[PDB]
């Protein structure tokens, strides 16, 4: 049931897009966002620990993103290579974790 | 650097296999094991929270597996459909998580 929608879907180069999260579960340890349609550490954008409120960037961090405490992801100054899928993984306290995929298109 | 090796690699139907974990990082919240070569909640075997020492089964749990506190995974009474890839994800305190893939073959 966790979902993400991009706002806007079609984004103009140089403008911004918000990946808005819906149905965020409770009893969470943290968030991890990835570029592409799969959880993979080689393409992690950012890790975020809820208790300490610490964001840590990953290999796919571009320096134009902001993760908020509700797990939504802002990307500013979009370029053509931002186009595609993004994957949010949410880590539950029982370690039975949940993923959701979003997407947007830069024109 | 996290890795997993199956012992034995080639496993006889009805016998057991241990997915032994190496280089387990420190400062971990938990473990999640998956069937297949990717982290995906629809194929989660088990979630394990280190602090409370609780295992919770996922959709791909067969009832023949045991995860230990060092993250190694025993599978007993193997069948032909156990053949293939397994994926361990390790959740770090900074949420910049690590994955490793193992495999074995049932003959």
UniProtKB/Swiss-Prot annotation, chains A, B:
Residues 5-107 are annotated as: Required for homophilic binding. Keywords: Cell junction, Cell membrane, Cell projection, Cytoplasmic vesicle, Disulfide bond, Glycoprotein, Immunoglobulin domain, Membrane, Phosphoprotein, Pyrrolidone carboxylic acid, Repeat, Secreted, Signal, Transmembrane, Transmembrane helix. The keyword Transferase does not apply. It is found in: Cell projection, Microvillus membrane; Apical cell membrane. Changing residue 47 to A: Impairs interaction with HAVCR2. One of its GO terms (cellular component) is basal plasma membrane. Induction: Induced in primary T cells by activation with IL-2. Residues 1-107 form the Ig-like V-type domain. GO terms for molecular function: actin binding; bile acid transmembrane transporter activity; calmodulin binding; filamin binding; identical protein binding; kinase binding; protein dimerization activity; protein homodimerization activity. The modification Pyrrolidone carboxylic acid is found at residue 1. Glycans are attached at residues 70, 77, 81. The keyword Isomerase does not apply. Its main location: membrane. Expressed in columnar epithelial cells of the colon (at protein level). The predominant forms expressed by T cells are those containing a long cytoplasmic domain. Expressed in granulocytes and lymphocytes. Leukocytes only express isoforms 6 and isoform 1. GO terms for biological process: angiogenesis; bile acid and bile salt transport; blood vessel development; cell adhesion; cell migration; cell-cell adhesion via plasma-membrane adhesion molecules; cellular response to insulin stimulus; common myeloid progenitor cell proliferation. Ig-like V-type domain mediates trans-homophilic cell adhesion through homodimerization and this active process is regulated by tyrosine kinase, PTPN11 and PTPN6. Ig-like C2-type and/or cytoplasmic domains mediate cis-dimer/oligomer. Belongs to the immunoglobulin superfamily. CEA family. Monomer. Oligomer. Heterodimer. Homodimer. Cis-dimer/oligomer (via Ig-like C2-type and/or via cytoplasmic domains); induced by trans-homophilic cell adhesion through an allosteric mechanism transmitted by the Ig-like V-type domain, and is regulated by intracellular calcium and calmodulin. Interacts (via cytoplasmic domain) with calmodulin in a calcium dependent manner; reduces homophilic cell adhesion through dissociation of dimer. This is Cell adhesion molecule CEACAM1.
């Amino acid at each position: 049931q966790l979902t993400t929608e991009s706002m806007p879907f079609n984004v103009a180069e140089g403008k911004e897009v918000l990946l808005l999260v819906h149905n965020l579960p409770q009893q969470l340890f943290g968030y991890s966002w990835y570029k592409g349609e799969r959880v993979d550490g080689n393409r992690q954008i950012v890790g975020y620990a809820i208790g300490t409120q610490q964001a840590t960037p990953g290999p796919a961090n571009s320096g134009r993103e902001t993760i908020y405490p509700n797990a939504s992801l802002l990307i500013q100054n979009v370029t053509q290579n931002d186009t595609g899928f993004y994957t949010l993984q949410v880590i539950k306290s029982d370690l039975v974790n949940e993923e959701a995929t979003g997407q947007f298109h830069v024109y």
